[PDB]
RNA sequence: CCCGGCGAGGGGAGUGAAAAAGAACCUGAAACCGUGUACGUACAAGCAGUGGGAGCACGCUUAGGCGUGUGACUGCGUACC
RNA sequence: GUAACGGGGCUAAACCAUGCACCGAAGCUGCGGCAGCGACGCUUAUGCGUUGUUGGGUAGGGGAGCGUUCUGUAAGCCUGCGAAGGUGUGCUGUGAGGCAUGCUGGAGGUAUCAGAAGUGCGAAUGCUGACAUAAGUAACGAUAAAGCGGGUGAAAAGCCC
């Protein structure tokens, strides 16, 4: 017959915490990534948001292999004349090492508006720690 | 022996404007602009009747997936386990059976789980 | 009482001469 | 009890009316000639004879009260157009249109 | 210094949106006459804040 | 087309389509590409396919039934009220009357009543043959359509 | 008979089968210009369509998750000659 | 303006060698449907009916058709109980199409089979007429120069004193 749909005035989405200790930036950011969208979620419906939202705590401690906590550099303009600011994966760290996780996950997220729509409910911390202790996250180990 | 086209020519682009109605501007409204679009939307129409069913297809295969990988096995797997128990339901039906019967889906992986072993 | 009006737009204006008239290129 | 009044071939074209039968549109009548007195534009005068026009209708056909009145609709059509030439710079010629209006307006007690 | 295109009817009004005229909507009475009028100008009768100025 | 031989334009430099005559074609006024003129439509027939012809469609109204032989065919006075009477009587309306010899008397009463048509045997034609329900001939008119097509 | 500059233009009454046949008069299309409701739309980027495809509103689907409209999100997609 | 992995990203998600697994097209299979040709101890004017194979198309060639106007059938049927036209709606053909009746319109209307064409329009900087756009945008045509009081007057900067 015709297929099912999830209709986003009835789906379910659950709250996680994750910890991203030692973990490897770019082969985390794939699960957090597939989590949002609701991949897993057999429900799976292309348009609407079937996704999960998801904590994630010590953003200033995530791994990255090789020479790239020097190396690895972040590039942007400002649309302006010269524009172009550049600034390396330590730096980030630095500055603010929520960017990194957030950039990460950004970058794997479909891009267009239901692709804008996944990525609020990721909801990075640098600290260990988080206000939404009230939306009874459940941990997870991805 | 003179011929006046008056009555016909209106009909044949009735017809036209008449199949654009929805259509934004001067697509829905002058003649010229409509009968582009009509075709157009023909163009499509025939188009996305194949691309239709390529689309649907993927969308099965990734639920199963989902579905599978719930009770520990790959789609890939899983559809391998499924042949060589020579059992034949198709993607539909078992996208459909992911979804209102996660117990019959579930026998599904074992008996794909037992030829594949 | 409104009859048309004499309007006088025959309009035999068209068409006027015309130079470029004009840039020199451009051997 | 819709009543309607109306002035065939105004001498404005449509969109400058509008702008004034916008600010009545909906209003008790008494309070929308007002509004209509205050309102610098010629505009103002032509529409305005014809809600008083209209009011008349009202009290002496049928409906009357003045106290009952809204201005329930109001809508203002093109015209014809009057054709006429200007001359410009080297013998070349212009249309202008002398743009009209039909300007009507509705009023009722309910 | 022209169009490429012609603008369509949507963006006309849009530009229009700015056009509407606003109703004064502060009209006083004179407490002798007791005419509406527009505040701090005088009534058609001659009268203003009460007393007789002008004469007409 | 009455009307003048000058070219309206300059050929180049004015924006308009390029004219030659305010006669062509394609303006208003003096149009009419093909025109037509005063023609002949007639056609040959070879003299035996017209005979031929004659023959095959005789034949075909005696099969049908259509055909009416008399000894004689004539009228009175020349009243078209009693060639009315006649035809009536013979339960004939719609109907071609070939005789012998063009009768007058018959031919006169015959004029006004639009379903009766009256020939002599030397002016009949393909087409009247077939346009009337019933068609009379005369003993006379059988001999004379006879030797004619032989 | 009214509004109305002893105006124009309208509204009544009356003629008239019919006046939405009223001298800008048989019928009376469209581009174009309006008024009235239905739905949509101010974080969202492009031949404006089509394939999905949530609402919300109608005709009750006239007991049957049926037709019309509108259509958020989303996959494909550079007019014609 | 990162800018010479498409990008996020990868110490392996890189290369090499071996091995299984699945995705994937308008490829091939399946079911439903139409159409052209070819062979049938066939039917046997032929229609049939099973089997066989072919249906990407520019210039072009071959074959079938739709509609518009006019003459015949045509002093043939329909029509004031409402024609054409207009505009709505319904169903059906593989298509041009076709058929059906909601309201206007207010007189003409035409089966079937024949025949003859000023016979079908989106382009020709094609023609004529309406109507848009820019747009309520530019301009209001000696830098001689006006201010007040009356008056007339529906209303006065412009008119008369
Ligand atoms: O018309 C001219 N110029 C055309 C523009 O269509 C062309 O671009 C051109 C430019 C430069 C030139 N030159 O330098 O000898 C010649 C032609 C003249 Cl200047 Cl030749």
Redesign the interface.
Same mark, same amino acid.
């Given at each position: 017959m015709k297929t099912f749909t999830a209709k986003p005035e009835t789906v379910k989405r659950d709250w996680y915490v994750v910890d991203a200790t030692g973990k490897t930036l770019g082969r985390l950011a794939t699960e957090l990534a597939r989590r949002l969208r609701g991949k897993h979620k057999a429900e799976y419906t292309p348009h609407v948001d079937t996704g999960d939202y998801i904590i994630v705590l010590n953003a200033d401690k995530v791994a990255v292999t090789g020479n790239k906590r020097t190396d690895k550099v972040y590039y942007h303009h400002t649309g302006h004349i010269g524009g172009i600011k550049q600034a390396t994966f330590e730096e980030m760290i630095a500055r603010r090492p929520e960017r990194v996780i957030e950039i990460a996950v950004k970058g794997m997220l479909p891009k267009g508006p239901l692709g804008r729509a996944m990525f609020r409910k990721l909801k990075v911390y640098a600290g260990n720690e988080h206000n939404h202790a009230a939306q009874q996250p459940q941990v997870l180990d991805i | 022996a003179r011929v006046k086209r008056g009555v016909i020519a209106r009909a044949r682009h009735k017809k036209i404007l008449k199949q654009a109605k929805g259509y934004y501007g001067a697509r829905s409204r002058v003649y010229r602009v409509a009968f582009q679009a009509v075709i157009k939307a023909g163009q499509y129409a025939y188009r996305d009747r194949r691309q239709r069913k390529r689309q649907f297809r993927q969308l099965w295969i990734a639920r199963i997936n989902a579905a599978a990988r719930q009770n520990g096995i790959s789609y890939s797997k899983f559809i391998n386990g499924l042949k060589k128990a020579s059992v034949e339901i198709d993607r539909k039906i078992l996208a459909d059976i992911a979804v209102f019967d996660k117990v019959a889906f579930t026998a599904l992986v074992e008996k794909a789980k037992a030829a594949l072993a | 009482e409104q009859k048309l009006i004499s309007e006088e737009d025959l309009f035999s204006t068209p068409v006027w001469i015309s130079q470029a008239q004009g840039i020199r290129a451009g051997p | 009890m819709e009543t309607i009044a109306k002035h065939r071939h105004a001498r404005s074209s449509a969109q400058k009316v509008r702008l004034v039968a916008d600010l009545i549109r909906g209003k008790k009548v008494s309070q929308a000639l007002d509004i209509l007195t205050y309102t610098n534009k010629k505009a103002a005068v032509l529409v305005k004879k014809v809600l008083e026009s209209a009011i008349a209708n009202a009290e002496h056909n049928d409906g009357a009260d003045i106290d009952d009145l809204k201005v329930t609709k109001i809508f203002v059509d093109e015209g014809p157009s009057m054709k006429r030439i200007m001359p410009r710079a080297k013998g070349r010629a212009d249309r202008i249109l002398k743009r009209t209006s039909h300007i009507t307006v509705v009023v009722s007690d309910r | 210094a022209v169009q490429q295109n012609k603008p369509?009817?949507?963006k006309r009004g849009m530009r229009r949106s700015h056009?509407? *005229?606003t109703?004064?909507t502060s *009209?006083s009475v004179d407490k002798t006459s007791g005419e509406?009028h *527009?505040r701090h100008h005088i009534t058609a009768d001659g009268y203003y804040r009460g007393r007789k100025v002008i004469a007409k | 087309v009455t009307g003048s031989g000058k070219k309206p334009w300059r050929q180049k430099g004015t924006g308009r389509a390029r004219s030659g005559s305010i006669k062509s074609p394609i303006w208003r006024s003096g149009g009419v590409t093909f025109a037509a003129r005063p023609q002949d439509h007639s056609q040959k027939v070879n003299k035996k396919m017209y005979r031929g012809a004659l023959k095959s469609i005789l034949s075909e109204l005696v099969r049908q039934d259509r055909l009416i032989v008399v000894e004689k065919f004539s009228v009175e006075a020349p009243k078209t009220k009693l060639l009315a009477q006649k035809l009536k009587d013979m339960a004939l309306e719609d109907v071609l009357i070939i005789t012998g010899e063009l009768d007058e008397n018959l031919f006169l009463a015959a004029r006004n009543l639009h379903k009766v048509d009256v020939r002599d045997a030397t002016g009949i034609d393909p087409v009247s043959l077939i346009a009337f329900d019933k068609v009379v001939m005369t003993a006379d008119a059988v001999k004379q359509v006879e030797e004619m097509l032989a």
């Amino acid at each position: 017959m015709k297929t099912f749909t999830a209709k986003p005035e009835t789906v379910k989405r659950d709250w996680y915490v994750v910890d991203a200790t030692g973990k490897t930036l770019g082969r985390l950011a794939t699960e957090l990534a597939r989590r949002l969208r609701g991949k897993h979620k057999a429900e799976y419906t292309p348009h609407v948001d079937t996704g999960d939202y998801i904590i994630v705590l010590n953003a200033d401690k995530v791994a990255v292999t090789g020479n790239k906590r020097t190396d690895k550099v972040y590039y942007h303009h400002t649309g302006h004349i010269g524009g172009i600011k550049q600034a390396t994966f330590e730096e980030m760290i630095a500055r603010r090492p929520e960017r990194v996780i957030e950039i990460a996950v950004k970058g794997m997220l479909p891009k267009g508006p239901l692709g804008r729509a996944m990525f609020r409910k990721l909801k990075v911390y640098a600290g260990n720690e988080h206000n939404h202790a009230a939306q009874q996250p459940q941990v997870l180990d991805i | 022996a003179r011929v006046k086209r008056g009555v016909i020519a209106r009909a044949r682009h009735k017809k036209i404007l008449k199949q654009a109605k929805g259509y934004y501007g001067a697509r829905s409204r002058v003649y010229r602009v409509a009968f582009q679009a009509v075709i157009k939307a023909g163009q499509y129409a025939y188009r996305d009747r194949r691309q239709r069913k390529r689309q649907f297809r993927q969308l099965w295969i990734a639920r199963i997936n989902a579905a599978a990988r719930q009770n520990g096995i790959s789609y890939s797997k899983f559809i391998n386990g499924l042949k060589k128990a020579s059992v034949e339901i198709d993607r539909k039906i078992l996208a459909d059976i992911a979804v209102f019967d996660k117990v019959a889906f579930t026998a599904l992986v074992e008996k794909a789980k037992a030829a594949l072993a | 009482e409104q009859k048309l009006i004499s309007e006088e737009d025959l309009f035999s204006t068209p068409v006027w001469i015309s130079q470029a008239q004009g840039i020199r290129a451009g051997p | 009890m819709e009543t309607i009044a109306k002035h065939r071939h105004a001498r404005s074209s449509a969109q400058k009316v509008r702008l004034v039968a916008d600010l009545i549109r909906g209003k008790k009548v008494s309070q929308a000639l007002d509004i209509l007195t205050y309102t610098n534009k010629k505009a103002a005068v032509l529409v305005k004879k014809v809600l008083e026009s209209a009011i008349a209708n009202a009290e002496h056909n049928d409906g009357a009260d003045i106290d009952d009145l809204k201005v329930t609709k109001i809508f203002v059509d093109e015209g014809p157009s009057m054709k006429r030439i200007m001359p410009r710079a080297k013998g070349r010629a212009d249309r202008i249109l002398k743009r009209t209006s039909h300007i009507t307006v509705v009023v009722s007690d309910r | 210094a022209v169009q490429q295109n012609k603008p369509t009817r949507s963006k006309r009004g849009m530009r229009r949106s700015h056009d509407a *005229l606003t109703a004064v909507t502060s *009209l006083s009475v004179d407490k002798t006459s007791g005419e509406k009028h *527009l505040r701090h100008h005088i009534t058609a009768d001659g009268y203003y804040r009460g007393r007789k100025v002008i004469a007409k | 087309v009455t009307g003048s031989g000058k070219k309206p334009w300059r050929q180049k430099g004015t924006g308009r389509a390029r004219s030659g005559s305010i006669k062509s074609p394609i303006w208003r006024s003096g149009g009419v590409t093909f025109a037509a003129r005063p023609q002949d439509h007639s056609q040959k027939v070879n003299k035996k396919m017209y005979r031929g012809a004659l023959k095959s469609i005789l034949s075909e109204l005696v099969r049908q039934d259509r055909l009416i032989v008399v000894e004689k065919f004539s009228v009175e006075a020349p009243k078209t009220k009693l060639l009315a009477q006649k035809l009536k009587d013979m339960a004939l309306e719609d109907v071609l009357i070939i005789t012998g010899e063009l009768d007058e008397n018959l031919f006169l009463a015959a004029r006004n009543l639009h379903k009766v048509d009256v020939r002599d045997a030397t002016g009949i034609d393909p087409v009247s043959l077939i346009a009337f329900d019933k068609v009379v001939m005369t003993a006379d008119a059988v001999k004379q359509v006879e030797e004619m097509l032989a």
